[PDB]
Design a binder for this molecule. Structure first.
Ligand SMILES: Nc1nc2c(ncn2[C@@H]2O[C@H](COP(=O)(O)OP(=O)(O)OP(=O)(O)O)[C@@H](O)[C@H]2O)c(=O)[nH]1
Ligand SMILES: Nc1ncnc2c1ncn2[C@@H]1O[C@H](COP(=O)(O)OP(=O)(O)CP(=O)(O)O)[C@@H](O)[C@H]1O
Ligand SMILES: Nc1nc2c(ncn2[C@@H]2O[C@H](COP(=O)(O)OP(=O)(O)O)[C@@H](O)[C@H]2O)c(=O)[nH]1
Ligand SMILES: COc1cc(C(=O)N/N=C/c2cccc3ccccc23)cc(OC)c1OC
Ligand SMILES: [Ca+2]
Ligand SMILES: [Mg+2]
Ligand SMILES: [Mg+2]
Ligand SMILES: [Mg+2]
Lengths: 431, 281, 424, 52
């Protein structure tokens, strides 16, 4: 058994993190006070769920998590939430004043003064691991902390935990749930600085979550809570292999092996089905839905790209025979072209426990669901959209003085933008 | 009020569509690079489809189908017909063709009249026995205009045009009324029976083949496109597909009617204000 | 986080006094500092503007400044006069004679250290000082000259805090003295350098709105100030009540100011109703909020373009319908928003409406048409300065002609910087 | 073709193939210090300007 440490940065990272651990506790039968009656070994164990939860002599199951934000109001909800009893103070780190939507304030000015502390509190969790695999890092692209401090933290982690894997769950900005007009600047700056430090990153476009919530849950004006409960189901789908018995994606290393042949192109597209508001869909139908743009975590058209890898992760009443049948049908109906230097296939994982939903939430509990992870070049459409918004503002140097005022140089902007131009280029060389 | 942008000022067709739109009083033309448009009359090359359908509160429509180039490139049209089981190498209405790779398969057939034509925006049979108009003893080709809307309805404009030769074998343009009368007088048949049934069959076949790859049915932006199909007719009144053009012009006599038809069928269907086509399926 | 409020001079203290009456009412605070309200939303963010004193009384974090006592005597006997901390009344006796030089260099210099002592005492009792907001006019002597001297010394001492002003611009239509353009031109350069965000409140607009829209034959300063206090409540709603955003002065400046000198905002308010019970649908709020007749700076926004816009809607309404109507304004007038700042409009909602209204809307625009305001003042300045008319009032306080030349140039530079981006 | 079928009590996994193929601590501290020094410089220029 090898441990994983989850790190939540900025408002988006913290609030999504709080929703994921809630869902984890429900999935594992862990009550808000951290007890777990089904866990018959007290004060220890190397069970699969111990990859995310350590244990106390009193029987409390403690998330292997650190929450960090540069203002206190969001994390103050964790230490007073229904699951406040799970965490201890050393796990919740708050600063005085936030990054004011400014990458440079989060990376340079404020990040410099809190980074050693955050690393100490992470060191404390690492010291309790027999064999740490690495870190899962949750954050927005668009916030000053989520962008600026995350990129700083990822750098130090590569120094202090060189052999360890790092995965990202990143929120890509959408004007329909906008916080700041400079979010394109922050997104590109943090992608440039984090790119060589991240082995695999799952991007979620708030535009896609917003529309799925409006369309499939009939929510007129989705809130962050609506969004995060949907996001947490998807995150849960991705991490379930780490927390349950199984043979697919059983350590962090395996995510890279199965989804990322070319290391810079490490952004798999996630697609999830079914999303139903509170008739039961078949294996064929939920699989077919994995190839509809309307169910993707990033709106884009995979028909106009090439696949490098594809993983299907089923929860519920699913048997391999029905998956093979469904795949037979879809392949002869849909445009699914792999790159020539990869095999045209699917890795399939099935967890018999159907998805858990928060009681009273907006998601209907289903008998089967699936999350597809595909490394398709079509996700580059999201880079192109973002790089274009960057270019419009940067041509006039709009808002740049806020970043130079924090000690950043103007040349870091065009340095980061040239990297993104090379990224868009690498994606096109594959297609 | 609906909004549109113009990104191909060389478009004879859509220069007229925009004139009609503006003259509606209910469409406003924006600067090309303004993203808050309902309608993009996009550029012929490198149209940024990835930036469409991401503007909150805008239904967005564009006058090109992403991926339709497979049909409208001479090289990939050959690949598409031979490798699509829907069409397959054994379809009766496309001449034997080869790209240049395929050097060695070509010669396997050439060894055995072997007149061939070569072209490239790759080598196919030259139709030695074209149907010749009289008087004149001359060669022609048939242009058909086809509109595919956002629902993938297929609309064949009822007016085609023949591009005639002056030399043995007005404006080298003959329209369907006259060609029909000729076929009745010379060969005792009609344009509908001897030719158009084949043309409609080929148009349906080509466009239903690619529909899974290019349809915008469940997509975050919608597409339509105007296609120009080019046909040859042999002495036995068999129709052959030559080329599919994705950016066609029109005959001056028919711009008014067709461009208006575009507004009614492809644009106003999505953006309604306050026939001349044959629907194939 | 805490904000320290300063009100300076006659205008500054009169609009500042009404501001505290208005927001005290909204937060359920009576004239004696004791709270009486039915909703805890009133208290979630009350420490932004109020200190919690001994017992459970709330005290405005407000400093009242003037070089003569008259206007602050009437504040102290005003409706909410007794809520203010008596130590925070800081005044002299000389006055400033509608003279920027007296406010900035002679009379004001003698009093400013005492103001900074009170500011320091308030900032020290702040868990996390956000910054300062100053109310003042630019046409007089104390608000304009001593007010701009104050912000300069506040910047020197708290350089990393935000400086926000509500600045009343003079107009010949609503004028006390002919030297107002001199005082306003001297002040604007100070504001260009030493504030992060300035709400431009033009007495020309306030008069036209009272006269034309509210149908007030013969507006008074009191009527002008009713418009101003309504606007001030609007623009500070996000600071004073919880929203989806964690709103504060620095995030506002980051998102509103693309270039450091262009931080002069056009405020607006809707509805403006003559004394009324009529329901106003969300489409009506949105068109009125964007209408020139509802702007407080007397600049035609169609003569320029919007760099950034913040909008705040107050009351019970469909947030879906808010987004729809807001998106509709942007998509159907996209020319009047600059294309090189994508998605430059942010909307906030607050379920609590202001006193007397079911629904209201507040507009904050960073528009290049504000150059018309600075050009109007520049023209009026030059008409006198080319004849050196009335300059002896200033040279008598030790100022030189060169300093007027330098303020005229700085002003015209500002106008040209706006025109630079109006064509782009 | 199906391969690598592993079966346990909580589920199973397998693979379907349809067609074969055809900076150190010091460096970081340096960039952070450089930014802080530029910050300190801009600040001293402001306080020099205000002293004038
Ligand atoms: N899905 C989702 N997105 C969020 C959530 N909270 C914020 N966001 C998004 O995150 C971006 C804003 O960044 P934040 O995380 O709020 O900012 P921050 O990381 O706290 O950094 P600061 O600038 O210091 O506040 C926007 O694009 C928001 O839409 C959340 O709970 N869920
Ligand atoms: N296989 C063939 N048999 C007979 N004629 C052929 C032929 N291929 C091409 N042609 C002749 O070539 C002419 C047009 O050639 P082609 O269609 O390949 O080029 P192009 O792309 O310029 C056509 P368009 O002007 O419609 O865009 C037609 O008039 C036709 O008679
Ligand atoms: N809106 C408004 N404007 C005022 C008020 N009092 C003065 N003014 C304007 O402010 C300017 C005069 O400055 P004033 O504040 O009286 O002088 P000060 O005491 O030296 O600051 C002129 O432009 C007046 O029209 C007021 O109560 N309300
Ligand atoms: C919407 O209004 C407010 C926003 C804030 C605030 O934190 N951030 N503002 C952000 C932003 C502003 C204006 C335009 C934008 C366009 C797109 C995205 C964000 C922006 C604070 C306020 O008060 C200080 C406030 O009220 C005036
Ligand atoms: Ca145990
Ligand atoms: Mg934050
Ligand atoms: Mg051609
Ligand atoms: Mg006065």
């Amino acid at each position: 058994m090898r441990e994983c440490i989850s790190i939540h940065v900025g408002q988006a990272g913290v609030q999504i993190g709080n929703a994921c651990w809630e869902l984890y506790c429900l999935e594992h039968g862990i009550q808000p006070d951290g007890q777990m009656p089904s866990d018959k070994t007290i004060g220890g164990g190397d069970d699969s769920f111990n990859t995310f939860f350590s244990e106390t002599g009193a029987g409390k199951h403690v998330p292997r998590a650190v929450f960090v934000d540069l203002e206190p109001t969001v994390i103050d909800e964790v230490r007073t939430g229904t699951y406040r009893q799970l965490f201890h103070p050393e796990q919740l780190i708050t600063g005085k004043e936030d990054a004011a939507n400014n990458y440079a304030r989060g990376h340079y000015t404020i990040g410099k003064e809190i980074i050693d502390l955050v690393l100490d509190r992470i060191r404390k969790l690492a010291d309790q691991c027999t064999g740490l695999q690495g870190f899962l890092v949750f954050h927005s692209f668009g916030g000053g902390t989520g962008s600026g401090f995350t990129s700083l933290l990822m750098e130090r982690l590569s120094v202090d935990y060189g052999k360890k894997s790092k995965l990202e769950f990143s929120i890509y900005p959408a004007p329909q749930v906008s916080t700041a007009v400079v979010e394109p600047y922050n997104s590109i700056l943090t992608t440039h600085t984090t790119l060589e430090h991240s082995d695999c990153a799952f991007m979620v476009d708030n535009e896609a979550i917003y529309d799925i919530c409006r369309r499939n849950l009939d929510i007129e004006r989705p809130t962050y809570t609506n969004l995060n409960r949907l996001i947490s189901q998807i995150v849960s789908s991705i991490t379930a292999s780490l927390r349950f018995d199984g043979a697919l994606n059983v350590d962090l290393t395996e995510f890279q092996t199965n989804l990322v042949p070319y290391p810079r192109i490490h952004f798999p597209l996630a697609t999830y089905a079914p999303v139903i508001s509170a008739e039961q869909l078949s294996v064929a139908e939920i699989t077919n839905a994995c190839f509809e743009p309307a169910n993707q975590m990033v709106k884009c058209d995979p028909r106009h790209g090439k696949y490098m890898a594809c993983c299907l992760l089923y929860r519920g009443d699913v048997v391999p025979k029905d998956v093979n049948a469904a795949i037979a049908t879809i392949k002869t109906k849909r445009s699914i072209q792999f790159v020539d230097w990869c095999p045209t296939g699917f890795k399939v994982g099935i967890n018999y426990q159907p998805p858990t939903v928060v009681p009273g939430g907006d998601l209907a509990k289903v008998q089967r669901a699936v999350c597809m992870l595909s490394n398709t070049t079509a996700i580059a459409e999201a880079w192109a959209r973002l790089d274009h918004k960057f270019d419009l503002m940067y041509a006039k140097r709009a808002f740049v003085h806020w970043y130079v005022g924090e000690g950043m140089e103007e040349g870091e902007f065009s340095e980061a933008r040239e990297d993104m131009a090379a990224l868009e280029k690498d994606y096109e060389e594959v297609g | 009020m609906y909004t549109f942008v113009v990104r191909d000022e060389n478009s004879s067709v859509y220069a007229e569509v925009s004139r009609l739109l503006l003259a509606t009083g209910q469409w406003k033309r924006l600067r090309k690079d303004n993203p808050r448009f309902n309608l993009m009359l996009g550029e012929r090359n490198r149209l940024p489809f990835g930036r469409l359908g991401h503007e909150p509160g805008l239904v967005q429509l564009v006058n090109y189908y992403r991926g339709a180039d497979k049909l409208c490139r001479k090289a990939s049209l050959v690949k598409l017909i031979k490798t699509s089981p829907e069409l397959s190498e054994s379809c009766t209405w496309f001449p034997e063709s080869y790209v240049i790779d395929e050097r060695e398969v070509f010669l396997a057939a050439y060894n055995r009249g072997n007149v061939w034509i070569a072209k490239s925006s790759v080598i196919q049979k030259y139709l030695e026995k074209p149907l010749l108009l009289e008087p004149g003893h001359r060669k022609f080709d048939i242009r058909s205009w086809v509109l595919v809307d956002h629902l993938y309805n297929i609309y064949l404009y009822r007016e085609g045009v023949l591009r005639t030769s002056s030399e043995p074998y007005e404006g080298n343009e003959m329209f369907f009324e006259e060609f029909n009368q000729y076929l009745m007088d010379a060969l005792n048949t009609t344009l509908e029976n001897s030719i158009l049934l084949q043309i409609k069959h080929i148009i349906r076949s080509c466009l239903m083949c690619i529909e899974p790859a290019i349809s915008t049915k469940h997509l975050h932006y919608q597409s339509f496109q105007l296609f120009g199909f080019d046909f040859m007719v042999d002495e036995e009144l068999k129709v052959w597909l030559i080329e599919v053009n994705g950016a066609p012009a029109c005959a001056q006599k028919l711009y008014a009617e067709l461009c208006q038809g575009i507004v009614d069928v492809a644009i106003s269907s999505v953006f309604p204000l306050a026939s001349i086509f044959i629907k194939l399926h | 986080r805490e904000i320290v409020h300063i009100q300076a001079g006659q205008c500054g203290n009169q609009i500042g006094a009404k501001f505290w009456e208005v927001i005290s009412d909204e937060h359920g605070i009576d004239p004696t500092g004791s709270y009486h309200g039915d909703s805890d939303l009133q208290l979630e963010r009350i420490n932004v503007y109020y200190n919690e004193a001994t017992g459970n009384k709330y005290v405005p974090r407000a400093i009242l400044v003037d070089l003569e006592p008259g206007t602050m005597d009437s504040v102290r006997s005003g409706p909410f006069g007794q809520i203010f901390r008596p130590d925070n009344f800081v005044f002299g006796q000389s006055g400033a004679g509608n003279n920027w030089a007296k406010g900035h260099y002679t009379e004001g210099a003698e009093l400013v250290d005492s103001v900074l002592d009170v500011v320091r005492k308030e900032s020290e009792s702040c868990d996390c000082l956000q910054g300062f907001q100053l109310t003042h006019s630019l046409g007089g002597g104390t608000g304009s000259g001593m007010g701009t001297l104050l912000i300069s010394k506040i910047r020197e001492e708290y350089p990393d805090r935000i400086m926000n002003t509500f600045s009343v611009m003079p107009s010949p239509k609503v004028s006390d003295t002919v030297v107002e353009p001199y005082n306003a031109t001297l002040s604007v350069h100070q504001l260009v350098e030493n504030t992060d965000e300035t709400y431009c409140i033009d007495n020309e607009a306030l008069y036209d709105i009272c006269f034309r829209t509210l149908k007030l034959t013969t507006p008074t300063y009191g009527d002008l100030n009713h418009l101003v206090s309504a606007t001030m409540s609007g623009v500070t709603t996000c600071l004073r009540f919880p929203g989806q955003l964690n709103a504060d002065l620095r995030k506002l400046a980051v998102n509103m100011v693309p270039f450091p000198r262009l931080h002069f905002f056009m405020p607006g308010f809707a509805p403006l109703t003559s004394r009324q019970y009529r329901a106003l649908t969300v489409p009506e709020l949105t068109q009125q909020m964007f209408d020139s007749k509802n702007m407080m700076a007397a600049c035609d926004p169609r003569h320029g373009r919007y760099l950034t816009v913040a909008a705040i809607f107050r009351g019970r309404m469909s947030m879906k319908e808010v987004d729809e109507q807001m998106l509709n304004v942007q998509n159907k007038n996209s020319s009047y928003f600059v294309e090189w700042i994508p998605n430059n409009v942010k909307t906030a909602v607050c379920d609590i409406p202001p006193r007397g209204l079911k629904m209201s809307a507040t507009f904050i625009g960073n528009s290049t048409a504000i150059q018309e305001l600075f050009k109007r003042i520049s023209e009026q300045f030059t008409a006198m300065f080319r004849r050196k008319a009335f300059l002896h009032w200033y040279t008598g306080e030790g100022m030189d002609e060169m300093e007027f030349t330098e303020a005229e140039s700085n002003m015209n530079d500002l106008v040209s910087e706006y025109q630079q981006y109006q064509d782009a | 073709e199906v391969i690598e079928l592993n079966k346990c009590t909580s589920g199973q996994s397998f693979e379907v193939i349809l067609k074969p193929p055809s900076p150190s601590l010091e460096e970081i501290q340096k960039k952070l210090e450089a930014a802080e020094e530029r910050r300190k410089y801009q600040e001293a220029e402001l306080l020099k300007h205000l002293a004038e």
